[model samples]
Target: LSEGEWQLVLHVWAKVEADVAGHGQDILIRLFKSHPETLEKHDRFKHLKTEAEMKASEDLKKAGVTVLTALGAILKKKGHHEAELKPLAQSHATKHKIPIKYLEFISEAIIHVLHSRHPGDFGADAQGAMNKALELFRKDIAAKYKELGYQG
Candidate 1:
């Protein structure tokens, strides 16, 4: 990508990390509150109606925090992160015969969720975070193509 694009990506990555670190569980709570139907899809989160279940959800939130932290580190070190995701996204897309556009959509959706749920952290600007997500996605797709000996 161009230098300008890279700068945009870095800005977005910073916002994403901040949002997740600051309010990850709050986002999940809001999500479940709005879409209780999702509980049907994930057994671990199903039937979460009691105090114990809520506590368990908190544990899950902590786990998400851990994962997001690691992800943030990866984004900070762009080379390694790009190398890993490139092949992974490509392989999944190729295996499912899915258009790369779907991956792009998912990337944007993730940023949207972050921005919506943690608006305070994003400071009324989400473009940078969106750009970073797209950059990471592009790297992932390119890596996957290379792994298959195809031109990205």
Candidate 2:
């Protein structure tokens, strides 16, 4: 949220942007593998052996690219937040039905995966920015969940 934190997010995200698709790939790979138990909710990803079958899916790769690209855009502290993240939250709530814990895990995965991608980049300020970004997204999602009568 702070200017310094924002700077760090952009700084790290620049690196992520360079290899846009790869970053998305890394994010989901970490999420699904680390949190494989959580995959049951996502119809397309639930079944299959670990590394061998999980490599790619039809148009699934494009979705992951879109997924990470969208997440990257969300990380930006642009003012048009609702137009950006609110609809996403609504969709996740209405369509995906991903467990909140899994969603939280992806949040953490954002931090961990980026941190792992470039060890020294996510220092305190950067980490703080990333976390705050996640918080804002989560809060907005929860608020929409309330509006949508989400029991969870």
Candidate 3:
């Protein structure tokens, strides 16, 4: 998954409340499970669900939705199209100082987590959720670019 893919997943996750939270938890768990080494890098994921970890888990879930919604809203308000949005996305990546590729990795980690935590729901609803999210994102971007005074 690329940054674009992570953005896509976040967009989808933001549309549904419970699912968004669940998905975030699932992704975090899976990331630790698959790459236990990451525990060394981030203290929050280590140990068997510490109080802080639990809080952080919930926070990440909320953060995922918050960021996604904010991004969508910004784009809509700015009236940005795909062409214009690309620069905005790149600017975001630069501002965050995170590689764009991490986006896909995050998406992959998220899917892995969802599958492990709620295999049934992941199989049943993941596709639909992703579809809805992407659709909304595209429309939001289009509107945003227009608002921002970008023809494309």
Candidate 4:
């Protein structure tokens, strides 16, 4: 993302930083809802209730956030945290063996949650920044997949 876009990202994020768990849960629930099979490999997220109880998953309950949030939090400041997050994404890539086919979908799921849910807040600039952020993140994640010897 360009410098202004990054600034916009941090500005928007600051508005909701106090609700980190909520933000993470929102992304996870939206992801699971968008693709029901997404949670099939996650330890126990499949069982999360419809709308009321997206309560942060087991990881969030324990760490106040999920690997998703862990990586995102890292992203807001230090740029790349792929090494620390490798296991989280790697486990899905390997242990859970989630199809590489779903990467874009998952990225969209998250961007949708972060933008769509905040209709008023995600103005054109914000949307652009969010999209750019995902693009950068996806680029890095693609490299991660390459390192893991993924095909798709």
Candidate 5:
């Protein structure tokens, strides 16, 4: 990421931090609705068949917190926390059996939420930078899976 791109990412994330939980929930809801298969990986969320059910789930709320907090941690340091992120990748690969495509789904949801929230600010450049950052994240997680001998 270039200095400019990093600046744009941080600037946008600062806005998201204001309502991290809300945006997180929205992201997860979008993901689950668009890709129901992704919800199957999470036992807690699998039972939620309706949008209302998912919205009313406390587990879903906590899961949203977990998602945003992890992303906040990564963006806080400008994506240099490989040591911290590796464990998360390991858990996803080993325990959750998450495929790279699922991560991509989450990434798409993230960008979608971000764009919806900040339509004026999240322009083409910002979207491009965000995509680059997310692709880097996906690549890093994929590398960890590779190192652990997990093909998925």
Candidate 6:
């Protein structure tokens, strides 16, 4: 992302930083709704059969906070994301069994949450910038998976 694009992303992020975990929770909720199989990947959350059940989960709160916090780190680091994301690729390839496609799904969920919450701020330019960031993240993870000999 260009400096200006990064500024736009950070601008919107600053606006939502207060409820970063809530936004992350919302993203996961959106992700689960669109891809129910994603729930199976989480041992603690797999049995959550409904949105209400998932919402009430303490584990989900922690999971959400973890996700969005990582997202904040990634955003802050910009191009220096290898250290932050490669380990996750390793884990997904070896342990989590999370499909590469979840990257795309989660990207959609994130954008949905951001746009819905701050439509005025997350406008076209910010959306474009966010998409660029998401694609970069997806490709980085995919490349790491390939290097780890994990094919999907």
**What are the clashing pairs of model 1?**
9-132, 12-128, 12-129, 85-140, 86-140, 86-144
Give the candidate number with the greatest lDDT.
5
Tens-digit lDDT string for candidate 5 (26-46): 999999999998888888668
Superposed Cα deviation of residue 47, candidate 3 (Å): 14
Choose 2 or 6, whichever is better by lDDT.
6
Better of 1 and 2 by TM-score: 2
- Candidate 1 lDDT over residue span 1-152, tens digit each: 44555555566556666657344454444445555554343456667775346545755577447545655565555445755565455555465343455445444455666677556644434456446555665666655765666552
User: What is the per-residue lDDT of model 2 for residues 50-73, given as tens digits with 9 covering 90 to 100?
Assistant: 665566654345656887777777
Candidate 2 weakest lDDT stretch, 10 residues:
52-61
Cα RMSD to the true fold for all candidates? 6.2, 2.0, 9.2, 3.2, 1.0, 1.1
Deviation (Å) of 12 in candidate 6: 1.3
Candidate 5: lDDT of 142? 92
lDDT-sorted candidate list, best first: 5, 6, 2, 4, 1, 3
- How many pairs of residues collide in each model? 6, 0, 15, 0, 0, 0
Candidate 4 displacement at residue 49 in angstroms:
5.4
lDDT of 1 at 36: 57
What TM-score does prediction 4 earn? 0.75
Report the CA-based lDDT of candidate 3 relative to the real structure. Answer: 0.48
TM-score, candidate number 5: 0.95
Candidate 2 residue pairs that clash: none
Question: In candidate 4, what are the lDDT values of residues 1-152, reduced to their tens digit?
Answer: 67788887777676557677676667666676788777676665556655666563465344335545665675575356667557756876566665555656676766677676676777899878877776666666666766787644
lDDT by residue (1-152, candidate 6, tens digit) is 99999888888889769887688778899999998888788898788878888788899889988888888888888868999987788888878876678878889999999999999999999999989988888888888888888874
Q: Candidate 1 or 5, higher TM-score? A: 5
